[PDB]
Design a protein around this nucleic acid. Structure first.
Ligand SMILES: [Mg+2]
Lengths: 59, 79, 42, 258, 245, 158, 107, 190, 51, 51
RNA sequence: UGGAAGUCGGAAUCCGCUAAGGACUGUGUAACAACUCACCUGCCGAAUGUACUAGCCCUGAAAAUGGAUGGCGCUCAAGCGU
C-alpha cells in the first residue's frame, strides 16, 4: 500500500490542481474532524516536537 | 561580437591534396551507392509523370484550349 | 488639424500613401476585363 | 455522470439522478427500492428510487469505484424463479414469492437490511450497512496488492469473493469483513468472478485466457478450464448451476458443464 | 519580398463575411420592397449610431436597413432599367455617406413627428465643435471629472491612470488614488480637456467618454421618402440641403 | 428624495443573501435583517433557485421585487425534486419541459425580449433551455428550434 | 514585506511611466530581432535556436490547421476496462533478424 | 526590377523659403533656419509646381525608390520645425528623495545645461548638455515637468533621450523602484 | 516563491492574535496598532493570508 | 451593529464553537464599531448572553 | 467557488437584433466596472494576400605559434551563369 500511495495521490489530484496559477484545491486534508480533536492533536504535536528537540539536543 | 577590432584565426580556403582526393573518392563512392540503391529501390513510380500544364498568365491559353478541343473532335471524327 | 491618433505618438508625421512602385501601369477597366477573361478560361 | 430511470412500457424518463462528478460505472437496484451507484469521482451514493433524491453519499474510497454488489443480488436477479421449476399462478402471489425470497436473503438479526460492498482502484474495498450504520462503513477490506475489479456476495450471504489485478481472488467473511483465504493460481489479472448457487464454488475468469473453479470451503482449485485463446471478459454461472458461460477477446461463446 | 509584415492569424470564432453577406443584403432588400408602402432615407452623420437598436425596437412594424451605401443603392437600382419598383431610382440620389433605409406602412407624418421628437444626448465624435469648456479640477481625479460635485462623485479607478497619461493628463498615483498634481489640489492647475468653439479631436473625445461627459446629440434626419402608390419620391428639408450623388 | 436601484442575485428561501449587501446598505441606513427578511419573503416562491432581486431605496426603507429571468423560469418549470444545496452538489437539469410552457415563459419574458415576434422569443427561450441542458418534448431544444425555423412547428402569434 | 507585496505596490503606485510604450516597442522590434538571431548566431547556439524555431513553426501550423477544422477507443473493451490506459496493440519459422554483422575473434 | 521613374512631392507653405543646392537643403521660416546635407542619397530635386518640390529617382531599385519616402519625411519635418516648432514635455517622478533639477544657459557655448541632483538620494550631480538650438524650461503650469523646445526634431528628441537615459535605476528591482525622468508629451510649439 | 513571500511568525514570543468574521475591523485594528500594510476594504475576505 | 453581514447570534455561536481551542490562553472579546451602535442600544437579552 | 458577471476552472456553446458583433481575443477587478480583439459601417483609393519552387547571400559548430582563393588585391568585379 505505501509502495503505491504516492502515485495514487498524484493520480487522484495532480500537482497543477493543488498549487499554482490554475489550482482548484479548496479544502485541505486534515487528521482531525472536531475542535476537541484539533486541541488534543495540537497539544500532542507540541509534546512530540519538544521531545524531539530534547533528543536532538542530547544527541 | 568583437570581430572587427579583435578578429580570430582565419579559416583557410586553401585546400590540401589529401582532402581533395578524399572528397573526390567519397563523392564517387556515394554516386555508385545511390546508383545501387536506385537499382534496388522499392518505391512506386508512375509510368507517366504528372504534367504541369499551361501557365495561367500565358495570354493565349484559352485559344490554345479551343485548339486542343478542335484536334480532339477532329481525331474523334476521323477515327 | 488632424482628427485621428497615431499609435507611436509622432503626430507630425504626414498621412502616408501605400508603397506601390508599379502604380499606373494598368487601368481598372482593363483589369476588370482581364478578370472576366481569366475566370472564363479557368 | 447521470443515472436515468426509464419506464419500460412508455420509454420515458421518470427520474434523473445527478450529482456525481465522474462517470457512474456501476448501478444496482435493491429490494427496498433504493438505487446504489458507484462512480469515478471516488464516491458511492444511495438514492431513493421513488422520489429520485439522494439518501446517502459515501466518500471513503481513494480512487475509482469499479464495482458494487448487494447481499441480495442473486435473488433480485431471479425474482420468483427457483429450484421448484414451477411458477405461481397469479401476479400477486408471484410478487409475494419474490418478496419472500428477497427478505429471506436480506434478513439481518431478524430485520431486512441490504449490505453493500464496493471495490475500488485504491486497492481496497468497503462494506456498508446503510440501514443500521448510516455513513459509517462496517469494515474496510484490505489485502489486495493491486486494483480490485469485481466483487460479489455468496447466495447464502456468508462469504464475499473479490477478484484483483494482483492475479488473486480473495475470500472475506460477509459480516465483519475479515480476510479468510487467498485463491492463488492465476498468472494474469482476474477480471470476473461468479458464485455457484450452493455457495461451495466460485468461478473466476482472468486475462490469462483461463477460467478456474475454486472450492471455497476447502480453499483449493477444484477445476481448471482452458480453451480460450485470448482474454476472458465476461463470466456467468447459471442460477440452477448447470452451466457456466464465458466470453472474451476470442469472439466465441464457451459453455462449460460438469 | 522577404522583408514583410507578419500577417496575424486570428484564433477567434467569427470569420470575414465576403460576397455572401452582400447577396443576402440584396435579397433581403428586394424581398422587403414589395411589402411596404413607403421607403424613407435617413441620415445619421458623425454620430455613434448605437441608438438605432432602440429605434428598431420602437418601430417594430417597420424594417430598417443600415448596410453599405453602395450595396443598398445597387439593391434599390440606380437606373430605371435595373430598378426594382417604379421610381425607386429617384430615391437613390440621397444614398451618400452614412445613410439608412426605412420601409414602413405608416403615414409619413407619424414618422416625421417621431424623428423630430426623438432626442438623445450622446458622446461627441472627432470633428465636432465643442459647445463648452470642460476642465478637470486640480487635486483628486473623480469618475466624472467634476461634472457632478465630488461629495456625490466617486474617485476614478486606478486602472485608468496609464490611459489618462497616454491621453495626455499629467496624473499620478498617490497611495492608490489618481491625483492631478497634489492630493490637496496644489502645485498644479486644472486640466482643460476642451475649449468652447474648438473642433474636437479623437483624444479629447476619448477623454470625454472616459469621464462620461456628453457634448453632442443623436439625431436622425429624414431626407426623403418614396411612395409606392404614386410611385414617386417626395423630398424633405434635410434632403433639400444635403449634397446628392 | 432619490430612488436607489440595486440589483443582486439571491437564492430563494434563505436569509444570507444580505451578507454581501450589508457593507453597502449600512451607510445607506437600511436594516440588514429587515431587508433579508423582505428578500426571503419575496423569493419564497423561488425556493432553491438563483434569482435576480431588485431593491428600490427611498427614505431609508427598501422595496424588494424579483426580476424574472429565462433561466430561473425554465428551471422552475422543470419541476425538479427538492434538495439541500449544501449536500446535493453538481446537479444537472436533465428533465423535460413542454413547448406550451416554453411559450408561456416567452410571453413572460416579452418585456425583456427585443425580438419582433413571439416566434423569435420562443427561439431565445429554447436557446436558453439548451444552455441549461434540459429537453423539450423529450427532444433537444436545438432540434425544436430548428423545426420551428424550418416550419414544421408553428408558434401562435402574440 | 509579506504576501503579494509587489502586487500591492503595483496597485498603489502603478508602473514606471514608460513601461507600456516601452514593452510595445520591444514587442514591435521582436520580428527584426528574430531575423537578426536567425542570420547572426553561430555554432551550437545557432543550431539549437534553429531547431527550437522549427518546432515552434510546427506547433503554430498545427494550431492554425485545428482552428481551420473547428467547424467540421479502437478495440472493443468492457466497461470496467473503459477510460483506462490500454495498449494500442498494433510454415516459415524465420526469426525477425536472420542476419547480423559478424564478429571476428580479434574484435 | 529597376523602375524607370519614381516621384515624390513635398508641399511648401507660403511663409517658407527652401534652397536646395548639391542636395544640401536649407529651410527658412519664421522660427529660423535648418540645414541638412542629403548627398548620401541619389535624388533629383526640382520645382514641379509653385509651392511643390519634386523628387525623382531614375532607373533605381526598390530600395532606391523607397529612400525617397525617407527624404520626403525629413524635409517635411524640417518645414514643420521652421514653421510650428517641436516640443517635448518630460516629467520627473520620485518616491522618497525629491529630484532637484536646475536648468542653466552656458554663456560661452550658448547651449543649455541640465543638472540633476538627489536622484534616489545619490550625492553625484548628473549634468546633461543640450544640443544647440534646444531651449529647456522648468514648467510653471504643472508639477515636476521640463519642456524642451526647438526647431530640430532630431535635436529635441535626442536631448530628451539623453535626459531620460542619464537617470537609470541600476541593480534594483524596476517594478518597485519607479524613480526616473520620462518623456510625457510630444508635439508642436504652435 | 510562496515560502519566500511568507511572513515570519515566531511561535514562542509575545503575540496578539486577532480573529473573527470578515468585515468586523480586524485589519483596521492591526493597521492602527502596528506598521503592517494589511489592506482594509468593505468586502468579505479581503485578507486571504496571515499578516 | 451587524454591518459585517453576519448575525451576532452566529458570532456568539462561532465563539462558542472555537472556545475549546482557547484553553491555556487569554481571551478578549473586542466589540468594535462603537461609533455606529453602542452596547447599551442592544436589547437586554443579547447583552445578557454576551455577559 | 469565500468571491468568479465572456476573460481562476469543468462542460455545453443557442437564439434574437442584425450592417455586425465569440455564451468571447487579450489587459484589468475581490467581484463588478472599464479598455481591447475577432466582425461591421463611414473616410481614402487600385492593386493586393497566402503557400510553395528556382537562383545568389547569411546561419547551419569552432579550439589552441602568425598566414594564406599561390600572393597582392578585387564589389555595374579582377565574384557567379550563359
Ligand atoms: Mg474587509
Amino acid at each position: 500500500l505505501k509502495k503505491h500511495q504516492a502515485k495514487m495521490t498524484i493520480e487522484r489530484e495532480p500537482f497543477s490542481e493543488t498549487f499554482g496559477p490554475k489550482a482548484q484545491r479548496k479544502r485541505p486534508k486534515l487528521s482531525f474532524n472536531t475542535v476537541d480533536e484539533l486541541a488534543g492533536y495540537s497539544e500532542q504535536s507540541l509534546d512530540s516536537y519538544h521531545a524531539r528537540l530534547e533528543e536532538k539536543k542530547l544527541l | 561580437a568583437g570581430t572587427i577590432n579583435k578578429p580570430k584565426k582565419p579559416t583557410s580556403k586553401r585546400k590540401t591534396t589529401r582532402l581533395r582526393a578524399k572528397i573526390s573518392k567519397r563523392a564517387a563512392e556515394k554516386k555508385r551507392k545511390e546508383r545501387k540503391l536506385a537499382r534496388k529501390n522499392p518505391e512506386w513510380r508512375s509510368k507517366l509523370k504528372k504534367d504541369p500544364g499551361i501557365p495561367n498568365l500565358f495570354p493565349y491559353k484559352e485559344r490554345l484550349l479551343q485548339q486542343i478541343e478542335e484536334e480532339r473532335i477532329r481525331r474523334k471524327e476521323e477515327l | 488639424k488632424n482628427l485621428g491618433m497615431r499609435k507611436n505618438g509622432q503626430v507630425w508625421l504626414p498621412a502616408k500613401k501605400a508603397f506601390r512602385p508599379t502604380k499606373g501601369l494598368t487601368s481598372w477597366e482593363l483589369r476588370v476585363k482581364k478578370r472576366q477573361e481569366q475566370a472564363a478560361m479557368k | 455522470c447521470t443515472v436515468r430511470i426509464w419506464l419500460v412500457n412508455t420509454g420515458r424518463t421518470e427520474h434523473v439522478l445527478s450529482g456525481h462528478k465522474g462517470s457512474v460505472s456501476c448501478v444496482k437496484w435493491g429490494g427496498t427500492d433504493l438505487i446504489y451507484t458507484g462512480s469515478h469521482d471516488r464516491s458511492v451514493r444511495v438514492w431513493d428510487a421513488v422520489k429520485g433524491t439522494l439518501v446517502h453519499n459515501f466518500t471513503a474510497h481513494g480512487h475509482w469505484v469499479n464495482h458494487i454488489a448487494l447481499s441480495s443480488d442473486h435473488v433480485l436477479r431471479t425474482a420468483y424463479h427457483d429450484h421448484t421449476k414451477e411458477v405461481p399462478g397469479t401476479e400477486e402471489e408471484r410478487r409475494a414469492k419474490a418478496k419472500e425470497r428477497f427478505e429471506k436473503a436480506a434478513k439481518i438479526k431478524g430485520k431486512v437490511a441490504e449490505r453493500l460492498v464496493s471495490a475500488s482502484d485504491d486497492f481496497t474495498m468497503y462494506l456498508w450497512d446503510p440501514t443500521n450504520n448510516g455513513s459509517k462503513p462496517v469494515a474496510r477490506l484490505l489485502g489486495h496488492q493491486n486494483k480490485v475489479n469485481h466483487v460479489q456476495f455468496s447466495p447464502d450471504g456468508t462469504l464475499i469473493a473479490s477478484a484483483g489485478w494482483d492475479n488473486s481472488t480473495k475470500l472475506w467473511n460477509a459480516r465483519d469483513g475479515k480476510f479468510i483465504k487467498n485463491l492463488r493460481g492465476h498468472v494474469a489479472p482476474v477480471y470476473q468472478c461468479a458464485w455457484s448457487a450452493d455457495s461451495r464454488l466460485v468461478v473466476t475468469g482472468s486475462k490469462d485466457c483461463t477460467l478456474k473453479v475454486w472450492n471455497v470451503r476447502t480453499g483449493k482449485l477444484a477445476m481448471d478450464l482452458p480453451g480460450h485463446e485470448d482474454e476472458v471478459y465476461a463470466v456467468d454461472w447459471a442460477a440452477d448451476g448447470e452451466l457456466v458461460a464465458s466470453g472474451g477477446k476470442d469472439k466465441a461463446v464457451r459453455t462449460w458443464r460438469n | 519580398p522577404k522583408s514583410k509584415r507578419a500577417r496575424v492569424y486570428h484564433l477567434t470564432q467569427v470569420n470575414k463575411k465576403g460576397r455572401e453577406a452582400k447577396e443576402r443584403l440584396f435579397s433581403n432588400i428586394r424581398e422587403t420592397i414589395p411589402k411596404y408602402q413607403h421607403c424613407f432615407v435617413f441620415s445619421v452623420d458623425n454620430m455613434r449610431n448605437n441608438y438605432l437598436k432602440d429605434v428598431r425596437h420602437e418601430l417594430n412594424d417597420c424594417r430598417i436597413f443600415f448596410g453599405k451605401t453602395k450595396l443598398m443603392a445597387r439593391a434599390l437600382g440606380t437606373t430605371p432599367e435595373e430598378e426594382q419598383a417604379d421610381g425607386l431610382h429617384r430615391l437613390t440620389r440621397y444614398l451618400t455617406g452614412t445613410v439608412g433605409l426605412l420601409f414602413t406602412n405608416r403615414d409619413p407624418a407619424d414618422i416625421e413627428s417621431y424623428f423630430s421628437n426623438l432626442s438623445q444626448v450622446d458622446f461627441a465624435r472627432a470633428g465636432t465643435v465643442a459647445p463648452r469648456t470642460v476642465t478637470v479640477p486640480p487635486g483628486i481625479v473623480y469618475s466624472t471629472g467634476g461634472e457632478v460635485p465630488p461629495e456625490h462623485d466617486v474617485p476614478v479607478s486606478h486602472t485608468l491612470e496609464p490611459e489618462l497619461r497616454r491621453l495626455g493628463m499629467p496624473v499620478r498615483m498617490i497611495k492608490g488614488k489618481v491625483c492631478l498634481g497634489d492630493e490637496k489640489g496644489e502645485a498644479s492647475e486644472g486640466y482643460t480637456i476642451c475649449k468652447e468653439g474648438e473642433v474636437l479631436d479623437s483624444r479629447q473625445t476619448r477623454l470625454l467618454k472616459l469621464f462620461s461627459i456628453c457634448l453632442s446629440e443623436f439625431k436622425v434626419s429624414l431626407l426623403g421618402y418614396w411612395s409606392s402608390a404614386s410611385g414617386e419620391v417626395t423630398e424633405l428639408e434635410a434632403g433639400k440641403t444635403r449634397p446628392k450623388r | 428624495n432619490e430612488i436607489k436601484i440595486i440589483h443582486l442575485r439571491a437564492t430563494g428561501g434563505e436569509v444570507g443573501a444580505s451578507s454581501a449587501l450589508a457593507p453597502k446598505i449600512g451607510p445607506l441606513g437600511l436594516s440588514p435583517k429587515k431587508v433579508g427578511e423582505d428578500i426571503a419573503k419575496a423569493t419564497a416562491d423561488w425556493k432553491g433557485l438563483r434569482v435576480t432581486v431588485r431593491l428600490t431605496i427611498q427614505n431609508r426603507q427598501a422595496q424588494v421585487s424579483v426580476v424574472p429571468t429565462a433561466s430561473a423560469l425554465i428551471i422552475r418549470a422543470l419541476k425538479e425534486p427538492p434538495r439541500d444545496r449544501k449536500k446535493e452538489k453538481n446537479i444537472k437539469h436533465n428533465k423535460s419541459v413542454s413547448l406550451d410552457e416554453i411559450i408561456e415563459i416567452a410571453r413572460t419574458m416579452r418585456f425583456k425580449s427585443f425580438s419582433k415576434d413571439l416566434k423569435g422569443g420562443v427561439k431565445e427561450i429554447l436557446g436558453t433551455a439548451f444552455s441549461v441542458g434540459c429537453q423539450v418534448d423529450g427532444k433537444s431544444p436545438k432540434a425544436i428550434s430548428d423545426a420551428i425555423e424550418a416550419g414544421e412547428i408553428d408558434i401562435p402569434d402574440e | 514585506p509579506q504576501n503579494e507585496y509587489i502586487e500591492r505596490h503595483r496597485k498603489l503606485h502603478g508602473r514606471r511611466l514608460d513601461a507600456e510604450e516601452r514593452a510595445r516597442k520591444k514587442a514591435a522590434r521582436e520580428g527584426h530581432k528574430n531575423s537578426e538571431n536567425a542570420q547572426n548566431l553561430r555554432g551550437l547556439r545557432a543550431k539549437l535556436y534553429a531547431k527550437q524555431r522549427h518546432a515552434q513553426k510546427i506547433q503554430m501550423r498545427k494550431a492554425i490547421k485545428q482552428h481551420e477544422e473547428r467547424n467540421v477507443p479502437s478495440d472493443p473493451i468492457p466497461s470496467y476496462l473503459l477510460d483506462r490506459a490500454n495498449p494500442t496493440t498494433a510454415a516459415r519459422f524465420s526469426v525477425p533478424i536472420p542476419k547480423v554483422r559478424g564478429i571476428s575473434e580479434e574484435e | 526590377m529597376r523602375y524607370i521613374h519614381s516621384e515624390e512631392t513635398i508641399p511648401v507653405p507660403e511663409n517658407v523659403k527652401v534652397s536646395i543646392k548639391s542636395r544640401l537643403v536649407t529651410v527658412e521660416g519664421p522660427r529660423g533656419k535648418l540645414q541638412k546635407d542629403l548627398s548620401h542619397i541619389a535624388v533629383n530635386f526640382s520645382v514641379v509646381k509653385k509651392g511643390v518640390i519634386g523628387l525623382e529617382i531614375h532607373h533605381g531599385s526598390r530600395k532606391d525608390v523607397a529612400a525617397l519616402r525617407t527624404v520626403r519625411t525629413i524635409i517635411n519635418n524640417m518645414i514643420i520645425g521652421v514653421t510650428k516648432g517641436f516640443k517635448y514635455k518630460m516629467r520627473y517622478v520620485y518616491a522618497h528623495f525629491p529630484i532637484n533639477v536646475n536648468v542653466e544657459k552656458n554663456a560661452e557655448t550658448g547651449c543649455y545645461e541640465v543638472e540633476i541632483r538627489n536622484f534616489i538620494g545619490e550625492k553625484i550631480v548628473r549634468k546633461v548638455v543640450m544640443a544647440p538650438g534646444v531651449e529647456v524650461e522648468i514648467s510653471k503650469a504643472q508639477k515636476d515637468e521640463l519642456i524642451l523646445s526647438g526647431n530640430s526634431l532630431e535635436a529635441v528628441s535626442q536631448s530628451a533621450a539623453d535626459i531620460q537615459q542619464i537617470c537609470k535605476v541600476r541593480n534594483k528591482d524596476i517594478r518597485k523602484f519607479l524613480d526616473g525622468i520620462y518623456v510625457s508629451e510630444k508635439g508642436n510649439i504652435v | 516563491q510562496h515560502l519566500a513571500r511568507l511572513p515570519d511568525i515566531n511561535p514562542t514570543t509575545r503575540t496578539l492574535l486577532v480573529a473573527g468574521f470578515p468585515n468586523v475591523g480586524k485589519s483596521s485594528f492591526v493597521r492602527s496598532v502596528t506598521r503592517a500594510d494589511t489592506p482594509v476594504e468593505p468586502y468579505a475576505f479581503t485578507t486571504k493570508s496571515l499578516f | 451593529s451587524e454591518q459585517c453581514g453576519f448575525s451576532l447570534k452566529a458570532q456568539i455561536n462561532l465563539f462558542k464553537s472555537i472556545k475549546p481551542l482557547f484553553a491555556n490562553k487569554m481571551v478578549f472579546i473586542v466589540l468594535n464599531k462603537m461609533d455606529i451602535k453602542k452596547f447599551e442600544e442592544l436589547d437586554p437579552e443579547m447583552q445578557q448572553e454576551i455577559n
